[PDB]
Symmetry: D2
Subunit: 355 residues, 4 copies
């Protein structure tokens, strides 16, 4: 278990950006800019800095050309410049490796702290960032599939309770989780900004990055991304969805970038900012928990996820989950799920829902 520092936690505002290492910057540009319509804040031959429609900070996504596709940093913005000092002291007390650069690691970010966190993930904390033109009323640019905000990250980690306690001490509040009747936790969602999540934990071998999620305004915007992918004859890069989530109540879609980094498109979850916000726990065998309509979750959603880097840019070693596998217990050969608790009718034994 991860101890609670004496040192005060930094005041974290929200998830702010991810830096993803990609192998072919032009193929990645085509996906994120031409297919998905993200806005270029800055680009050169090594990196593309992208932002969503409503963002005013420099970027929400940094694509960095490199030899091995992986997450290099998941960044959270903190409330004040002095919260970057707080973050540094906090992670030092945790005995984590840290690195601080007063002029930032990427363009458009100033004084920033990167850490290898207790779960093996590269977190950044920053306040200072270069403001850019907020494009929120640039309806002359607005795409039928427009991505309007960065919403969250999702992390694969082998021991969810261990990770949950650490994130709670950091000030994240759990909104929803998935457990069973035998004391296992399979997933948890937690926030700072008053939505269902800024980050989330999915039980599995880790550290790996499960996905980065962007918001749309409306459900038809997500439908348009699917339709466009069909027209481009790249429907094979649609992994799962579109659907309605149980957990989060959001309308969603999962797609795969050219290096198989998973992107979620997400809309219309609910407000969580009250400190006694009711926590919702789903049973792992409830077939409406992930897709509310009961559509089956493809095995790749559970098994595939991106590598993460340490502060030297090397791939973090993967530690195997020993807790029960959500895949195995719901859709594996001895799996089970139900539509109605206690009802044999609409239940699934050793197979996924819908045939």
């Amino acid at each position: 278990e991860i101890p609670k520092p004496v040192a005060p936690a930094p005041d974290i505002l929200r998830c702010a950006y991810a830096e993803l290492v990609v192998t072919d910057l032009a193929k990645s540009r085509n996906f994120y800019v031409d297919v998905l319509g993200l806005h270029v804040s800055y680009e050169d031959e090594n990196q593309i800095y992208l932002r969503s429609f409503e963002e005013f900070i420099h970027h929400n996504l940094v694509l960095t050309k490199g030899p091995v596709a992986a997450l290099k940093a998941m960044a959270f913005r903190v409330r004040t410049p002095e919260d970057v000092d707080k973050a540094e002291a906090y992670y030092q007390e945790l005995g984590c490796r840290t690195e601080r650069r007063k002029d930032g690691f990427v363009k458009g970010i100033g004084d920033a702290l990167r850490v290898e966190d207790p779960l093996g993930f590269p977190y950044e904390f920053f306040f200072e960032t270069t403001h850019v033109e907020r494009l929120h009323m640039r309806y002359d640019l607005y795409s039928a599939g427009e991505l309007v905000r960065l919403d969250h990250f999702n992390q694969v980690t082998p021991d969810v309770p261990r990770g949950r306690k650490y994130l709670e001490d950091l000030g994240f509040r759990v909104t929803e989780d998935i457990q069973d009747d035998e004391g296992t936790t399979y997933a948890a969602w937690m926030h700072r900004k008053g939505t269902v999540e800024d980050t989330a934990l999915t039980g599995g071998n880790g550290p790996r990055l499960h996905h980065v999620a962007f918001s749309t305004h409306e459900k038809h915007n997500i439908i348009q991304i699917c339709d466009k992918m069909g027209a481009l004859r790249i429907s094979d890069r649609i992994e799962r969805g579109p659907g309605r989530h149980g957990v989060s109540n959001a309308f969603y879609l999962y797609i795969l970038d050219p290096d198989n980094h998973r992107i979620e498109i997400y809309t219309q979850d609910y407000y969580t900012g009250d400190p006694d916000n009711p926590t919702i726990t789903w049973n792992v065998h409830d077939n409406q928990r992930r897709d509310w309509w009961g559509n089956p979750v493809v095995p790749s959603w559970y098994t595939e996820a991106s590598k993460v880097l340490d502060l030297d840019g090397n791939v973090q070693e993967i530690i195997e989950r020993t807790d029960d596998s959500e895949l195995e217990v719901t859709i594996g050969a001895d799996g089970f799920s139900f539509t109605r608790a206690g009802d044999e009718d609409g239940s699934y034994h050793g197979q996924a829902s819908k045939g």
Copy 2:
């Protein structure tokens, strides 16, 4: 081949209603009224008569209590009263069994002809119907999942070219179909009213009714039906979708009523009313033909469909398809499909997507 009668074909306007036999009227009522929000035009202890939001004829759906769930009649409205006489002469010349009721078979329909058609389906033709309040601006009644029009029927039949030619002789025009390079036809869609379909043929064992389809105004109305079914903890009755179709380009959902009658919810196909409307043929192995997003088609969608009745109310015997099976050639052990033709990447062999 079904010969073309010398007698003139009835001028068919559109699909108008289906009469479905149901086993438990109250359970059916709960599904079609409380879950789906159809509007009651009449009911008693034996039948419920229902219509969509924008309809002015008496009904689009009749639920009739009976011992065996089945399609009892798929009804088309014809342009004039004389077209019912034309229908009678046409089907008589085809050698089909017919029954004429000058005062109708169901309430709110007048002079009507029912036939056991050459594919074994119970068709009704009528002009006369009781007009009711058109609810198209009754936004005080409008549901988040509102069903606004009856759009089409879909019939399972073993020989699609045989059925197609018969429907063409009746004035239906084919808009889209699915074929392979070997020359097999797997499915065809055909219309009178200037949308992609009023009826459609799915290759399979028949006669069986594949589904009845209703439209919504917008895609979010279809999403809401799914969301409602999740809240009612009946998500197991969502069979397939929601999706974008390849064929028709419509946004769609398939759901199952208490007797396993399949209902499609549909929106935003295209105009087909010009007589040289371009006909679109998809290859059966194209994994974007049925769901444009490449989502797999569950086997039950190909194998399960409703019984149909003859004019005595007995179940029509089924004839097995001898042409190749769409299920088998796409998702069965020897099947395949592609995302991009000639590309093994994004292709599926012996396996769905």
Copy 3:
């Protein structure tokens, strides 16, 4: 206007309009760059445009000329022989006709243009060059995509006279607006089984009130508004967005660079049954035009496009003598109601929502 002995042509639908525009590049910016229509052909003289779901060559031809005006409103007929029928029909009416075996505009074949009994330049054609139907080209689809041509709307001084003539041509009236003392202010009529393929608005005419395109959904119309705000051309949004009473469609009216009015429209209802119930609204009903009761801007009633004769000269305008919809509803002696018979929610001598005429 007498019913000919000659049979009417079988009209399928409205198909395209040819608009004369004064600055081709400025018009192109509006129809292509702002509105997203798709180019079938263009040169220094003309731009040929189609909607997202169209397979015929075009829905709109922009023709450079000295005086902005409607040059032709074109209806597609069912067969080649229907063009001959249209020629015989209009000749029996005593109208000036001109037949070109190879068309008046590119991508149309054998075509008949007529100066009709109301002064309007109608075209009838069957033959047209098919193009790529873009209906699944979601790689092109804009947030404001115009998906079909829906209808025309004509300003004419005597609505019943026009209505009777269109009925003889096979159009069926769906909705109209009347008062209690026998004046008709507007009528809507169709061939293709929607509310309208053309429509008559009482006023000085012949003038073209608007051409209408459809979207898939209501949000697509909202986006057009939003885009016009971002482009700082909100002054070219004339009226809306709204819900119509008549037609029940969601709508918007915008103005092109020559003040030609374009309606964007969605989700009217099916009218293809021959006994489709007609709907008559009282002119004083403040929900008849905008169902939400929003006021109808006076320019909507007063302004419309010139139309040309077959020589390309402007048709002389004839004044309406029947009562004016503007005057009887929102003028200083006008009135409208929310609930018939109820003084609460009624407006006298001004428009709804607290405005009077500017």
Copy 4:
């Protein structure tokens, strides 16, 4: 100028509910429940307690029968029980009248402080509230016009800068405002919860309550409210809209309840939770600032607003605005508005946009 207290400001989470006095409880219930679809948490012969689709606290709106329709309280939830004490101390230091009820003023609220604030408005601060069933996935109940959240209040007050500074000291951050080139502020918007607004100030005679705002998921939900009001033949109760706002970038509608309390329906503003969120200032003469599409702002929007009560339940006296009037300077006789700054084309002199004048 309202001084900054030495005492620490309470930590405010969000706007939480309004209590409105209504004259005919059954008529008001018809509007809020039968027309708008809000969910009943409790009712009796005297009050109706209502909540939105996604709410878990007891209510977002209390309708209280009384002789004079008015705003009785605009309630903000605070982060901890101790923040109610901080609120009491803060407002006492400001010299404001306060009333503390350990078991609440209304049902489903616990320990609560009501205050006559320095602008004359009845504010409530509370933490304790009865949780109820959160209906966020009850799609069996979901209306085509569903109101999903309470979003904000908007207050009419004569001196906007004075109010703005007081709210900033209380920890609200201004997201957008409307000013001119002569030093006048006409309106300001300010938040705690990380949306454009939890409350907002509109220049005019006050204190009066301009509106309470609820959100929908999507724009079509707002369209449906309008459609339904047409079907119910109460389109006269649609005051303004629907539209796209300039300020907030939200899609919006204003409607009027049976006592002429104004309700806004709103959707799809943007995130403001970063502390250096860029403040957007619109010029008062920009004809896209209130309605982005340039539609004219109905004069009642500027002139009409609800009475507010003091802690005794008496109506607060109105103080006249002496700063320039937004109505007068934009759509009045000597008014002016533009579409494009510096362009005469698309400008309006002494009248409203789109061909209208003041009635």
